């Protein structure tokens, strides 16, 4: 809208196509990672982590 | 006894069944019906002349080949010197009205015969000439009440010296010095009746026909129309067994039988229009493939809540299919990259095609617990707005319009000009220079210096907050 | 004055039938087609259920198309597609229509049990589907010629009566029929057709059944509903949203039956309309008829045919009339009964350093929950710019925030409540106290109110937001003022278990103790002699006290004295305000005691000084019960010496009694009763000897020889003191335990000879576990009684509520003490406490009036009455109220958790209601809950009693013909009564005397129809009140009669006319009504006569039947019949009522809002 346009004129931050969905720790849950698991569709690349 | 299944069943089990000269029968009829409205819809000059005004404007590219003939009784060329035929035979049989003529109008009518004419044209005809016809009776119905019902005059003696004329003036005005009751007070409605036959004797212009044999043709015609329907009737309901003979094929491809034999059962009704017994088709083998026709065209289009295109279906049916032998011979199930090599397609469409194909859950789905929890219950709206934003968006003009109070008038101007800033659009950098007759780089000059104006603290501590 | 237009805030509401116009009013477009979205794009298709140009935008403020894409264009209509740009919420709002091409019925008003249509035709309903199946021909408008109206013929019959009359005759079939039937019925002419018919021919038989019907059809007429509405020519379709489509996870789409079921009707309708232009058949276009409307009705309510079920799912698609239904009438108000913003919940713990007033609330809890405050509290300082940079703060919780909290915490109440909600005290407010954790801390005194225990029981927590409920909270619903209980006026705060001990050991004495014989000041250096060690809590000593005593006009007397007293008593009388006199302290103080303490603090100084009082009694009970470490070993339990002796001679008894069996000198039946009585007897035995030897053995010395006081064993202070523990229970641990019953009943004549102190053996554990399992069975279903009755009893009551002042009727009803058979089971001054006089009260002697007229009679005025010998008073009850459509507040009585006389508003039938039901988990399974409500359900007993008609001499005629006629002869009056009682029943009655009216001609128990019908009004509610306080007094339960008595007042609301002049001689109705008419007869228009009635007994489920509110009924009664039972009528909902305020969310017409609906009732009917 106008006045979030104009927020961007003044900060300069050049909003993103790409919205942010990432997996976050719960409010109020808190430990120590174990383990991670990366299963992936037959066909997609794998990243450099999986 | 409710249960419609169960009052149809018997409702159709009255009707018995056709013997195999029995289908003859009704099907002789049903020519006779239809050649008749055939020959009475050829013995209409409005209807003759109104296809001549009508091929003009195909050779004049006013319409096209398509659109008035689907062929007749025996090509661009074909086209154009049959309908020189009819023109031909038209123009000698209309000179000759000097009685003799009966004989040459009955050939107009031969040349007419041999046109099968598209549908939609051949219905306007019907339609024009009941629409005239409706003329004439309206016509009709003025003289009779003004004379009838307002100047008191009998019916009995009405229609003696009507019968062959009703157009001129013998029964208007010469029925008045008969010296009858009835007589004398046929003079106050002269002036109503006598002015409105002028529609009436113009049909007799137009049509180029006495109100005499107006009525007997399109009556002929309505006979045999009226004639072809009941044979075709007939026909229909003897034959609803197969419908549902072959309606209870289909059951739970999702639509329910009555829909199924309903939408059938209008297979059979095409089947009976374009039959003919000449070819020595039994008609209990050819309709099957019309109504089978109808069920699975209706399935297709109407059976699904998202309704898809046909070669969909047909797409996603060779897929069942292939899995089947592929289930046990891979031992477990075909992989979804290996139908897809089976399948012509490019075959990462087998994905698209497979999302598409879900049917919609119910949303009244009950889940866990059989607590009335609905799965509808736990569907969340995603298109409101949390308070928390909107309180932040009330907020943000207060924060914006501030600070741009805090500004030069000009640049307050400037910067709710270049956004949307309380006002409908924006507008380009070369409007807002127009505005202020100082224009052009001098106002993009302004732009920037503000922005730096809000940039730095003292300003720029209350807007930062709004950034995560 | 202009009247107006626009939305203005609405008072009452209407129903009626919809036109097919009135549809097409609200359609905004016609759906035309079955398609839903593309396929593709998953866009609406135009013009189907989901359609941007008929219902709404997708998204906000955007055109379909794309073309308008701007939130300046509002009122615009796209010219590509016609779609007005605004808010896709009025794709929640737009509704739409279906053009049917034939007419079709409906099948609420064919199928709602009285089918309202065959009856408006007066003609039979398996006819009507006759004729709408296509099965048969029915006659219109007959003519004169050889046929009825309503007369219905077959296909040949049809056929041979067309060939005689072709015109002036008319028959059709199916709806179309049906329909014109309905337009064709003239009702005004019908009308005077009925009115003559009742009076020509006279018979019950016929005029019974005849009357029925002309009130219903004028009824109709007056209305304004046009009989032809029942069939549907336009059908409405709901908007889009409220039957979405919308998208899910993996891609994957959910949607509302109702696209099934509308959809199909769409189909079914176009096609017909196609097989309209092709001429079909008439065997096919009569199918797909019926086709259609199978699936209109399958659309509105499923069920009442096949019941059509959804595609490829088993489960029947659910339709309109099961979305408002459900279990119980609507779901919207159903118990659950809509999710709330601003709660929360969790396991809940003690914290009895708590002021009664406060509550331990969880730090995170109280950040979550007051977020918006925090959120403007802290951009009201200045420490953060903006509210999102506020959420940041808080988010990051910095610690700056914490202080702030305290600030927006400190006046805020919160609502506490426990899980099941009973009496009104299951929800009380609480002042937040800040606590690290998690965990709820909740003030000791209260876990009694709640019936909290701390087994693990959540509590959830409401934020009381705008300033009204706030104050609300704090002066109904904060914890401080309600200690008593509405359902008795007895303090509900009453110290509960840990505390009494701790006072029961405190204030005690033994003989021979630190201390003894010593005399102190004051209990200030009392203390300071127990606590350095010189004296012990429990010695004899006499002190120096001031006690007070205000008995003063309203003046504070002081008076010193030497008390004979201990040590505890002593220090305990620091803790004491000002007026009590140490008379109260002096005892032992048990459990019993201590509340009564609390009370009296109550009626004397008021509440304040109550507040602090009782939270100083908490502290120093757990404070000195602490110091008293009290414990229970397994020494604690002492069993008898003699046990095994007592269950020997026992013993000897069955061998005495099986030696009288096998040598026949007694029988079998004989041998399990004697049996099972001696070991009865033995059980006794056993518990009273455990109780004497554990009560005083402690034997001890003082300076003499030997002396024996009662005993400070660990386990027995608990039970003397009424802390925890019952001899019962007690007599299971040390003496024997029972006789347990086999599930048959019959309990068994070798009981548990064992203990708990002593362990049980295989057999004896394996047949107590009966009695345990079906305790809990039984508990928990009494558990689901309760819940039911409480319902039940809610609904008959609810929208009862103080209205006036003083209805100023010195009618009443006499209070005498209950004297059941032996002495006393409860005295007057219980009955009558915290009520109002019906007239002034005499002493034995007279020319003395102790109570003038109508006064309150509170704990003095009881006691002055109780000074002198009186020994019956009449007194106003809300069944004798003048006041009309509500309770005068003199009439109800004081009581609340105030002792001041109720106030004008509250809302008493809830209270009441909530205060009967709620202690119902406490009765057995004659006797026990289930005969309660027989009373209250009026349920006539099976072998009733029969009382004297009519006063006069009675006799005896004719002679056995299955019955004996009685015949009763009043001397002046007229003789005619004559009743058949079967003579084959016991008779009572003097055959040759005669019978005041109303007594006993049998016996056996009598049907309180009755009792109101011939002793009168006051004798049947004074029946139902000692009938149902015997089941509660009986398991020891104080219900005060107030609350009894105002369900009563609603079970007779209702009366049948006598005389005439002006309503319906037979007629049902309020009395309410009544008396204000006949008010409105006896000064107003023709006397007239009249009339009189009958005052009639409803149950309580029945009678909350008749409610005048549809809104209501539809709420908890059978939801589809009460809809169209009142759209028929047009009826008109005022509101008015409590329950329908609720569904429709506006202020309560009681309470805080008892203010406003006055002022707007009050603006109606004006100008
Ligand atoms: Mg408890
Ligand atoms: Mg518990
Ligand atoms: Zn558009
Ligand atoms: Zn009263």
């Not at chain 3, 109206?149 to 049906?178: H, N, P, S, V, W």
């Not at chain 3, 309708?269 to 019926?290: Q, T, Y």
């Not at chain 3, 925090?374 to 910095?398: H, N, P």
């Not at chain 3, 000198?665 to 009585?677: Q, S």
Request: proline share 4%; with cysteine; charged share 30%.
């Amino acid at each position: 809208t106008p006045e979030e346009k104009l927020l961007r004129a003044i900060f300069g931050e050049k909003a993103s196509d790409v919205k942010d969905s990432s997996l976050r720790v719960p409010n109020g849950v808190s430990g120590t990672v174990i383990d991670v698991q990366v299963f992936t569709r037959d066909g997609v690349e794998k990243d450099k982590r999986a | 006894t409710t249960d419609p299944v169960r009052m149809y069943m018997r409702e159709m089990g009255t009707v018995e069944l056709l013997t195999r000269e029995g289908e003859i029968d009704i099907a002789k009829r049903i020519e006779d019906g239809i050649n008749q409205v055939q020959c009475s819809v050829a013995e209409y000059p409005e209807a003759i002349t109104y296809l001549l005004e009508q091929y003009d404007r195909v050779e004049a590219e006013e319409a096209r080949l398509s659109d008035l003939i689907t062929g007749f009784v025996d090509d661009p060329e074909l086209a154009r010197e049959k309908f020189a035929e009819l023109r031909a035979q038209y123009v000698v049989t209309r000179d000759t009205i000097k009685a003799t003529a009966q004989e040459e109008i009955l050939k107009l009518s031969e040349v007419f015969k041999q046109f099968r004419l598209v549908p939609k044209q051949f219905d306007y005809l019907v339609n024009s000439m009941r629409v005239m016809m409706d003329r004439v009776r309206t016509q009709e119905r003025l003289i009779m009440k003004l004379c009838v019902e307002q100047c008191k005059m009998p019916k009995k003696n009405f229609i003696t010296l009507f019968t062959g004329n009703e157009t001129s003036d013998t029964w208007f005005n010469a029925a008045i010095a008969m010296n009858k009751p009835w007589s004398e007070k046929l003079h106050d409605v002269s002036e109503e009746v006598h002015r409105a036959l002028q529609k009436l004797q113009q049909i007799e212009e137009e049509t180029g026909l006495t109100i005499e044999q107006v009525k007997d043709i399109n009556r002929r015609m309505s006979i045999g129309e009226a004639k072809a329907r009941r044979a075709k009737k007939e026909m229909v309901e003897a034959n609803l067994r197969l419908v549902i003979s072959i309606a209870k094929k289909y059951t739970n491809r999702g639509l329910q039988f009555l829909d199924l034999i309903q939408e059938g059962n209008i297979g059979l009704m095409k089947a009976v229009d374009k039959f003919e017994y000449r070819r020595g088709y039994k008609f209990s083998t050819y309709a099957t493939w019309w109504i089978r026709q109808a069920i699975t065209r209706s399935i297709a289009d109407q059976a699904r809540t998202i309704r898809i295109p046909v070669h969909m279906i047909e797409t996603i049916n060779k897929l069942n299919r292939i899995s089947r032998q592929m289930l046990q011979e891979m031992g477990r199930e075909p992989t979804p990259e290996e139908l897809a090599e089976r399948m012509l397609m490019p075959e990462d469409k087998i994905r698209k095609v497979l999302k598409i194909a879900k049917e919609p859950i119910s949303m009244e789905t009950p889940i866990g617990d059989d607590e009335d929890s609905h799965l509808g219950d736990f569907i969340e709206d995603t298109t409101l707005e949390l308070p928390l934003d909107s309180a932040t968006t009330e907020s943000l003009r207060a924060a914006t319009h501030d600070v741009l109070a805090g500004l030069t008038a000009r640049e307050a101007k400037v910067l709710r000009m270049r956004f949307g800033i309380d006002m409908n659009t924006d507008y380009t950098l070369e409007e807002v220079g127009k505005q202020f007759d100082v224009t052009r780089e001098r106002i993009r000059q302004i732009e920037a210096k503000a922005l730096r104006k809000l940039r730095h603290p003292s300003r720029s501590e209350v807007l930062r907050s709004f950034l995560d | 004055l202009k009247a107006q237009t626009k939305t203005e805030e609405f008072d009452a509401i209407k129903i009626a039938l919809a036109s097919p116009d009135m549809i097409r009013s609200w359609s905004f477009g016609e759906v035309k087609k079955p398609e839903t979205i593309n396929y593709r794009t998953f866009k609406p298709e135009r013009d189907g259920l989901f359609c941007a140009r008929i219902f709404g935008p997708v998204k906000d403020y955007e055109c379909l198309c794309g073309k308008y894409k701007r939130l300046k264009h509002r009122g615009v209509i796209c010219e590509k597609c016609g779609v007005e740009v605004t808010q896709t919420k009025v794709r929640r709002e737009r509704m739409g229509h279906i053009e049917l091409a034939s007419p079709t019925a409906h099948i609420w008003f064919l199928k709602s049990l009285p089918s309202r249509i065959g009856l408006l035709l007066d003609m039979p309903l398996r006819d009507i589907e006759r004729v709408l199946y296509f099965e048969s021909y029915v006659v219109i408008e007959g003519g004169m010629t050889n046929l009825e109206r309503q007369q219905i013929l077959t296909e040949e019959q049809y056929l041979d009566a067309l060939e005689e009359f072709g015109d002036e005759f008319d028959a059709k079939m199916g709806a179309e029929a049906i329909q014109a039937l309905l337009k064709s019925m003239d009702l005004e002419q019908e009308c005077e057709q009925l009115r003559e018919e009742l009076n020509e021919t006279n018979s019950e038989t016929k005029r019974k059944k005849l009357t029925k019907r002309i009130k219903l059809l004028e009824a109709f007429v007056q209305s304004g509903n046009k009989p032809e509405w029942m069939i549907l020519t336009v059908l409405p379709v709901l908007p889009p949203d409220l039957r979405p489509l919308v998208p899910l996870d993996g891609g994957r789409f959910a949607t509302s039956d109702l696209n099934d079921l509308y959809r199909r009707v769409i189909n079914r309708n176009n096609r017909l309309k196609r097989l309209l232009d092709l001429a079909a058949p008439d065997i096919i276009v009569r199918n797909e008829k019926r086709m259609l409307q199978e699936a209109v009705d399958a659309l509105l309510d499923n069920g009442r045919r096949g019941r059509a079920i959804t595609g490829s799912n088993k489960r029947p698609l659910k339709s309109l009339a099961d979305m408002i239904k459900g279990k119980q009438g609507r779901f919207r108000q159903n118990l659950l009964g809509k999710r709330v913003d601003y709660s929360g919940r969790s396991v809940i713990t003690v914290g009895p350093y708590l002021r009664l007033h406060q509550c331990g609330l969880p730090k995170k809890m109280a950040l979550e929950l007051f977020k918006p405050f925090i959120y403007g509290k802290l951009e009201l300082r200045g420490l953060a710019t903006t509210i999102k940079a506020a959420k940041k703060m808080v988010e990051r919780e910095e610690a700056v925030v914490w202080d702030i909290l305290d600030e927006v915490i400190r006046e805020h109440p919160v609502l506490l409540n426990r899980a099941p909600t009973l009496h009104r005290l299951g929800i009380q407010a609480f002042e937040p106290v800040l606590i690290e954790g998690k965990a709820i801390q909740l003030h000791p005194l209260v876990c009694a109110a709640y019936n909290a225990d701390f087994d693990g029981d959540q509590m959830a927590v409401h934020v009381p937001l705008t300033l009204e409920a706030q104050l609300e909270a704090r002066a109904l619903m904060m914890s401080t003022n309600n200690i008593l209980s509405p359902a008795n006026g007895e303090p509900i705060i009453v110290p509960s278990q840990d505390v009494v001990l701790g006072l029961y050991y405190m204030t005690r004495d033994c003989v021979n103790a630190k201390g003894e014989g010593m005399v102190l000041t004051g209990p200030k250096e009392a203390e300071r002699l127990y606590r350095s060690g010189l004296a012990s809590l429990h010695a004899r000593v006499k002190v120096r006290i001031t006690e007070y005593e205000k008995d003063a006009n309203g003046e504070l007397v002081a008076k010193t004295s030497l008390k004979d007293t201990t040590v505890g008593r002593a220090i305990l009388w620091m803790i004491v305000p000002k007026g009590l006199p140490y008379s109260i302290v002096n005892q032992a103080l048990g459990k019993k005691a201590i509340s009564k303490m609390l009370n009296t603090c109550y009626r004397i100084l008021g509440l304040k000084p109550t507040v602090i009082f009782a939270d100083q009694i908490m502290y120093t009970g757990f404070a000195y019960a602490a110091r008293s470490g009290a414990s229970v070993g397994i020494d604690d339990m002492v069993i008898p010496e003699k046990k095994h002796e007592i269950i020997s001679e026992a013993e000897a008894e069955v061998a005495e009694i099986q030696e009288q069996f096998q040598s026949g000198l007694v029988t079998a039946g004989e041998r399990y009763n004697k049996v099972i009585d001696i070991w009865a007897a033995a059980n006794d035995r056993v518990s009273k000897a455990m109780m004497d030897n554990l009560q005083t053995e402690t034997v001890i010395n003082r300076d003499g020889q030997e002396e024996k006081q009662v005993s400070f064993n660990s386990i027995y202070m608990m039970a003397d003191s009424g802390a925890r523990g019952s001899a019962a229970q007690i007599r299971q641990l040390a003496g024997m335990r029972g006789l347990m019953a086999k599930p048959d009943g019959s309990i068994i004549e070798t009981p548990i000879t064992a203990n708990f102190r002593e362990g049980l053996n295989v057999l004896q554990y394996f047949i107590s576990t009966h009695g345990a399992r079906k305790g809990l069975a039984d508990t928990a279903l009494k558990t689901a009684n309760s819940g039911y009755l409480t319902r039940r009893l809610v609904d008959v009551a609810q929208d009862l509520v103080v209205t006036e002042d003083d209805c100023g009727t010195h009618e009443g009803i006499m209070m005498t003490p209950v004297i059941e058979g032996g002495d006393v089971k409860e005295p007057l001054r219980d009955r009558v406490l915290g009520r109002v006089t019906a007239e002034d009260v005499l002493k034995p002697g007279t020319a003395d009036i102790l109570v003038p007229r109508n006064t309150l009679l509170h704990e003095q005025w009881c006691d002055l009455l109780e000074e002198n010998s009186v020994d019956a008073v009449k007194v106003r009850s809300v069944v004798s109220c003048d006041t009309d459509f509500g309770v005068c507040a003199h009439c109800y009585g004081r009581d609340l958790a105030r002792g001041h006389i109720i106030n004008k508003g509250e809302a008493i039938g809830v209270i009441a209601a909530q205060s009967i039901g709620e202690p119902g988990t406490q009765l057995t399974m004659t006797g026990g809950l289930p005969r309660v409500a027989d009373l209250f359900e009026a349920r006539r007993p099976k072998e009733p009693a029969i009382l004297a008609e009519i006063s006069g001499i009675v006799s005896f005629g004719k002679e056995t013909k299955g019955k004996r006629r009685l015949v009763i002869t009043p001397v002046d009056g007229s003789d005619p009564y004559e009743e058949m009682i079967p003579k084959w029943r016991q008779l009572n009655v003097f055959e040759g005397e005669r019978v005041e009216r109303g007594d006993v001609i049998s016996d056996g128990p009598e049907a309180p129809h009755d009792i109101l019908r011939l002793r009168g009004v006051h004798a049947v509610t004074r029946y139902i009140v000692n009938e149902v306080q015997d089941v509660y007094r009986l398991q020891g339960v104080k219900i005060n009669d107030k609350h009894i008595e105002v369900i009563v007042r609603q079970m007779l609301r209702k009366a049948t006319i006598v005389n005439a002049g002006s309503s319906d001689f037979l007629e049902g109705e309020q009395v309410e009504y009544s008396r204000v008419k006949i008010a409105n007869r006896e000064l107003e228009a023709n006397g007239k006569v009249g009339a009189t009635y009958s005052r009639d007994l409803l149950g309580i489920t029945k009678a909350s039947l008749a409610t005048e509110s549809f809104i209501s009924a539809a709420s908890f009664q059978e939801t589809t019949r009460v809809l169209t039972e009142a759209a028929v009528a047009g009826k008109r909902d005022e509101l008015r009522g409590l329950k329908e305020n609720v569904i429709v969310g506006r202020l309560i017409p009681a309470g805080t809002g008892y203010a406003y609906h006055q002022d707007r009732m009050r603006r109606r009917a004006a100008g």
